[PDB]
């Protein structure tokens, strides 16, 4: 090699040792994606723990990366498929649009891109909820017949001081994603179902446990553990 | 982009000196760094070499050993330590940026050069020192030693133009390619060994000297140079 | 089928 | 909305069209007049080979 | 009213479908039966261009063949010298998500497009010795997905909203636009005369568009599911298409109908992305198998596996003189082969 | 007898266990698999223990079968040297995949910072570092010599000196790491134990956790147990003492056989890589 081929070298050494130093800055923090539809909170949820837009978090010296595109989501969905995780925030209060809400996370999880992409799910306005059970006007049972014959399972003990009847409706509509999630799961890519509400402050340690657990997943599969 | 040197002076031989060189208009990190001494009754000859980081160094066989060069990226500055000059070490030091990358044309901008009088190699020739000429094609041919064409197919030959008073320019680089802004009136063609420089309607301020330089290996060899006169 | 070889190489050339 | 789509399905009904037999042999000519100029389908050499 | 322009729309639709049922009267298979065919053909990793730290999403060959520029999703731009496996140049993108690129025929720029609906256009060989973004092309609604460059000053571009644009750069807004399309615009390919180009959508159809007059001249239907990519024959009458159906078509402009369609039982994954020859005799292909697909041109027979890569291939490209193939995947390695 | 099953014996583990080292290799290589920690101590193990310790077993069997060495005075150390050296490489690098492991499950996130690539090159020269400084002396601890008429490879090292190195390569090599695989591994067990999936996954990791232990502590416990009962109690020469020698002998083989199958060949994802270069 010439001269010019060897500086050549040497500046593409450079080139690489800046594009190392780079990655290795980059691979510090932890994508995430949120989804969702409207009357959705996830505008309120985002600025609570404050084309495309973007939030930026930290927890535990932990850095993340929240972003979210503002139909038809089946080809863009392709570059979010090296994320973390994948965050789906849903209005369980609705219940007029919460069938095309499981509609929806059917797309997601069955998604051929997305087979190994874990996803935390948010059941957000939970307050709107529990007014709207107490209120009785609507009922679950008028646009789900299979609620009348859901009985609240054992061990639930969701939390002292709710009634029974917000507790049966919650889990119904949790075990509903649940089972959506769990038909074809095949223990490659898992469901992280959590009751958030509008107010509640700790959203962000919640997405930080389940970071967590997927994280300790991969590290398992990379071990040959699993 | 402005490069402005500073420095020299009249020393008593034997002494230490530094020059220090500074750069705008451009990113220095990126560029690598030459500096290049003319002698007031010679021709340009190369000094020294510094890379992009500072990785690999280069100096002439005459002042190997007692000159030092290196460079300050965030001060944007150069530095070249003289030491124990001789009496025919006072010459005119010029600062030359060059970057090195596929394509890409080094030497295009020399720097104003400062001034510090005291009190193998490719050998390259040039057959016509001056040589009287407007409106009249000129050719100028150099001669290397060794033929200029690595296995890779670039030809490494590169033509600087001095004007009277003023600082080298880049013109042709690799003996094909023309530098920015050289107007097209300028070609060159040749081969190994063998290299012929064209000048198409001369007209006003196209007088100078013309230098014939080869990259194939260091130490970078510059021709004696031909000089045009009306 | 203790070899020379083999007893000395577990035992030692003092006492193969 | 109508109105576009039937002035564009009106639009493209007047056009000149060639049989596919005479677009095949077309094909068939331009792909075997140049099969000397292809690299893939005819191998290099490897001194000639730039990679 | 509706009814007398649904029954005259119905009418011309019949009236197109009947005038290319009727040109159709020999098939392509039929007429290059009596040719030799290219037989088994292997290629080999002359040069793994190692240097992506994520999927490589998109690439495209220089005029000169030698470089090619790469655009991966952690937001580099690398522009490879392919012989040497060296990097010219590393431009650090404003977005990380990137789904095109784009390399200038003249060489002086690149262009790179992704969820930012913006296609940014980067300067290089300037002053300075820095690459800096020259024009920042804002106006679409939907993501970009793939754009390409006609001269210096012009662009087409493709992007998620069921459009296309022509740009001008020196203006900074759109001359021309083209719609129509019902899904995701998810590919385009131009025409060596520089004078139509052809895109393919999510609506399982693709659409030939003039630059000029910016008005659709052809529709082609012949696919079950979505477009994902699309090359134009080196001839100027003709073009392939390849669709998530796990099969490729290749139609032709003159005659408007479609000629062979390839397809295998073994395979079921879908086509990523699809390229032709110098000479267009054989057909390479990319599959999400992880792997590529050789397909002869005229023969439709599997003419070879570019088994290579890790992950599924994104990008495919043949240089303007056919002497390599470059095959870009999400295992952040990119290939040649020859 | 014995004489036509013990070459067969020792061809077929060295067989067995060059074809899964050739194969963990090939894979950890060029299966696409990239740099990274795991990857990095893994290959570690595969390469210097099992490929080392597989290509001197042929040595020790003709040192069973043949009567004599035949190798030569510069073979009669180097091979004693490389078989030490190596299984001290490996009993280190099963103590860094556990220490790795225990950082990637407990501190998922954080270790992320730690456990870089370079600081797994570091721990690797390390650990060699240790190795051959442990296995030093071993390089003139076997000599060659004359026995009766015929030549013989064997320990030319004083009573007490020898036995210092046996207990000190015992101690090292056998009790330190095993110590750090068992306190280790009963910390990662303790906290990963502290949905159907989720429990089938944590009974898939405590189950080849608990294979991995057993594995290092069973099958090179038998060859220091041997060695220490000859220094310090009446061991006795027998017909049954030399099956003991061949069964001490195999099972340490059968260690670094089986180390390629259990740490990586039996994932799924492994194998998905051996397809790939495939």
């Given at each position: 090699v010439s001269a010019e081929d060897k500086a050549a070298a040497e500046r593409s050494k450079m080139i690489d040792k800046n594009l190392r130093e780079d990655g290795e800055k980059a691979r510090r923090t932890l994508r995430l994606l949120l989804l969702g539809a409207d009357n959705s909170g996830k505008s309120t949820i985002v600025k609570q723990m404050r084309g495309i837009f973007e939030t930026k978090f930290q927890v535990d010296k932990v850095n993340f990366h929240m972003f979210d595109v503002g139909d038809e989501r089946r080809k863009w969905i392709q570059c979010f498929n090296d994320v973390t995780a994948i965050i789906f925030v849903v209005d369980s209060s609705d219940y007029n649009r919460l069938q095309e809400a499981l509609n929806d996370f059917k797309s997601i999880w069955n998604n051929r891109w997305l087979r190994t992409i874990s996803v935390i799910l948010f059941l957000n306005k939970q307050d709107l909820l529990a007014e709207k059970v107490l209120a009785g006007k609507s009922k679950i049972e008028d646009y789900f017949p299979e609620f009348a014959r859901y009985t609240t399972p054992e061990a639930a003990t969701p939390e002292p001081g709710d009634d029974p009847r917000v507790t049966r409706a919650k889990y119904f509509i949790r075990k509903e994603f649940v089972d959506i999630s769990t038909a074809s799961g095949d223990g490659r890519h898992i469901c992280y179902p959590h009751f958030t509400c509008a107010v509640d402050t700790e959203n962000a340690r919640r997405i930080f446990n389940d970071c967590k657990d997927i994280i300790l997943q991969m590290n398992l599969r990379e071990y040959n553990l699993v | 982009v402005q490069l402005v040197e500073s420095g020299g002076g009249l020393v008593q031989p034997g002494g230490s000196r530094k020059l220090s060189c500074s750069a705008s208009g451009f990113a220095f990190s990126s560029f690598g760094m030459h500096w290049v001494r003319q002698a007031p009754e010679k021709g340009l000859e190369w000094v020294a070499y510094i890379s992009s980081g500072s990785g690999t160094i280069y100096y002439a066989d005459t002042v190997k050993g007692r000159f030092t060069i290196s460079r300050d990226d965030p001060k944007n500055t150069l530095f070249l330590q003289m030491t124990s000059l001789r009496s025919e070490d006072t010459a005119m030091y010029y600062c030359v940026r060059s970057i090195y990358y596929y394509g890409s044309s080094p030497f295009d901008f020399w720097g104003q050069g400062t001034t510090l009088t005291v009190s193998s190699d490719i050998v390259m020739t040039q057959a016509t020192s001056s040589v009287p000429v407007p409106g009249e094609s000129v050719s100028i041919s150099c001669r290397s030693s060794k033929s200029l064409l690595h296995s890779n197919g670039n030809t490494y030959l590169y033509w600087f133009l001095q004007r009277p008073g003023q600082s080298p320019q880049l013109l042709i680089y690799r003996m094909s390619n023309l530098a920015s802004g050289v107007p097209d009136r300028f070609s060159g063609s040749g081969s190994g060994t063998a290299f012929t420089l064209t000048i198409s309607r001369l007209e006003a301020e196209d007088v100078g000297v013309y230098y014939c330089m080869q990259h194939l290996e260091y130490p970078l060899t510059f021709g004696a140079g031909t000089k045009l006169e009306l | 089928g203790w070899t020379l070889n083999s007893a000395g190489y577990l035992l030692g050339p003092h006492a193969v | 909305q109508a109105r576009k789509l039937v002035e564009q399905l009106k639009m493209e009904a007047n056009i000149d069209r060639i049989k596919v037999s005479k677009a095949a042999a077309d094909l068939m000519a331009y792909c075997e007049a140049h099969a000397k100029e292809d690299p893939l389908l005819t191998p290099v050499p490897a001194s000639e080979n730039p990679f | 009213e509706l009814d007398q322009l649904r029954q005259e729309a119905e009418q011309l639709k019949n009236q197109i479908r009947d005038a290319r049922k009727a040109c159709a009267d020999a098939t392509l298979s039929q007429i290059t039966n009596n040719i030799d065919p290219v037989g088994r053909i292997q290629?080999?990793?002359?040069?793994?261009?190692?240097?992506?730290?994520?999927?490589?999403?998109?690439?495209?060959?220089?005029?000169?063949?030698?470089?090619?520029?790469?655009?991966?999703?952690?937001?580099?731009?690398?522009?490879?010298?392919?012989?040497?496996?060296?990097?010219?140049?590393?431009?650090?993108?404003?977005?990380?998500?990137?789904?095109?690129?784009?390399?200038?025929?003249?060489?002086?720029?690149?262009?790179?497009?992704?969820?930012?609906?913006?296609?940014?256009?980067?300067?290089?060989?300037?002053?300075?010795?820095?690459?800096?973004?020259?024009?920042?092309?804002?106006?679409?609604?939907?993501?970009?997905?793939?754009?390409?460059?006609?001269?210096?000053?012009?662009?087409?571009?493709?992007?998620?909203?069921?459009?296309?644009?022509?740009?001008?750069?020196?203006?900074?807004?759109?001359?021309?636009?083209?719609?129509?399309?019902?899904?995701?615009?998810?590919?385009?390919?131009?025409?060596?005369?520089?004078?139509?180009?052809?895109?393919?959508?999510?609506?399982?159809?693709?659409?030939?568009?003039?630059?000029?007059?910016?008005?659709?001249?052809?529709?082609?239907?012949?696919?079950?599911?979505?477009?994902?990519?699309?090359?134009?024959?080196?001839?100027?009458?003709?073009?392939?298409?390849?669709?998530?159906?796990?099969?490729?078509?290749?139609?032709?402009?003159?005659?408007?109908?479609?000629?062979?369609?390839?397809?295998?039982?073994?395979?079921?994954?879908?086509?990523?992305?699809?390229?032709?020859?110098?000479?267009?005799?054989?057909?390479?292909?990319?599959?999400?198998?992880?792997?590529?697909?050789?397909?002869?041109?005229?023969?439709?027979?599997?003419?070879?596996?570019?088994?290579?890569?890790?992950?599924?291939?994104?990008?495919?490209?043949?240089?303007?003189?056919?002497?390599?193939?470059?095959?870009?995947?999400?295992?952040?390695?990119?290939?040649?082969?020859? | 007898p014995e004489a036509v099953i013990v070459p067969l014996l020792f061809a077929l583990i060295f067989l067995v266990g060059t074809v899964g080292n050739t194969l963990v290799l090939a894979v950890l290589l060029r299966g696409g698999q990239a740099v990274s920690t795991t990857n990095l101590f893994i290959l570690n193990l595969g390469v210097a223990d099992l490929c080392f310790i597989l290509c001197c077993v042929p040595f020790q069997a003709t040192i069973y079968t043949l009567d004599g060495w035949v190798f030569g005075s510069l073979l009669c150390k180097a091979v004693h040297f490389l078989i030490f050296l190596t299984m001290h490489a490996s009993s280190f690098t099963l103590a860094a995949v556990s220490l790795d492991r225990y950082l990637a499950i407990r501190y998922p996130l954080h270790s992320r910072e730690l456990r870089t690539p370079r600081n797994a090159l570091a721990a690797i020269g390390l650990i060699w570092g240790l190795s051959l400084l442990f296995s030093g002396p071993y390089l003139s601890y076997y000599q060659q010599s004359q026995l009766a008429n015929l030549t013989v490879c064997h320990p030319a090292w004083s009573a007490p000196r020898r036995r210092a190195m046996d207990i000190c390569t015992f101690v090292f090599s056998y009790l330190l790491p095993v110590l750090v695989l068992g306190l280790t591994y009963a910390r990662t067990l303790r906290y990963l134990w502290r949905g159907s999936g989720a429990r089938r996954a944590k009974r898939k990791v405590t189950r080849m956790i608990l294979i991995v232990a057993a594995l290092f502590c069973l099958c090179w416990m038998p060859h220091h147990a041997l060695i220490l009962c000859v220094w310090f109690g009446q061991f006795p020469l027998t017909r049954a003492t030399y099956a003991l020698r061949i069964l001490s002998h195999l099972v340490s083989y059968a260690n670094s056989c089986v180390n390629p199958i259990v740490y990586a060949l039996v994932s799924k994802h492994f194998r998905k890589g051996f397809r790939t270069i495939c």
């Open positions: - | - | - | - | 290629m080999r990793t002359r040069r793994t261009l190692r240097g992506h730290l994520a999927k490589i999403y998109a690439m495209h060959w220089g005029t000169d063949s030698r470089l090619l520029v790469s655009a991966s999703q952690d937001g580099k731009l690398i522009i490879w010298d392919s012989y040497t496996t060296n990097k010219v140049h590393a431009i650090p993108l404003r977005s990380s998500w990137v789904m095109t690129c784009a390399y200038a025929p003249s060489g002086n720029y690149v262009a790179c497009g992704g969820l930012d609906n913006i296609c940014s256009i980067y300067n290089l060989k300037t002053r300075e010795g820095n690459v800096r973004v020259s024009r920042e092309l804002a106006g679409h609604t939907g993501y970009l997905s793939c754009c390409r460059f006609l001269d210096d000053n012009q662009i087409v571009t493709s992007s998620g909203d069921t459009t296309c644009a022509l740009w001008d750069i020196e203006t900074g807004q759109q001359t021309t636009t083209f719609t129509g399309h019902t899904g995701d615009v998810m590919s385009l390919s131009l025409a060596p005369d520089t004078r139509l180009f052809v895109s393919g959508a999510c609506d399982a159809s693709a659409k030939l568009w003039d630059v000029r007059e910016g008005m659709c001249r052809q529709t082609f239907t012949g696919h079950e599911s979505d477009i994902n990519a699309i090359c134009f024959f080196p001839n100027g009458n003709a073009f392939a298409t390849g669709s998530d159906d796990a099969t490729c078509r290749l139609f032709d402009l003159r005659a408007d109908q479609e000629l062979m369609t390839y397809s295998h039982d073994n395979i079921i994954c879908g086509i990523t992305s699809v390229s032709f020859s110098k000479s267009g005799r054989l057909l390479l292909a990319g599959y999400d198998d992880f792997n590529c697909n050789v397909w002869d041109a005229l023969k439709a027979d599997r003419a070879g596996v570019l088994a290579g890569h890790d992950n599924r291939v994104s990008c495919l490209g043949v240089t303007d003189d056919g002497m390599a193939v470059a095959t870009g995947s999400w295992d952040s390695f990119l290939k040649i082969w020859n | -």
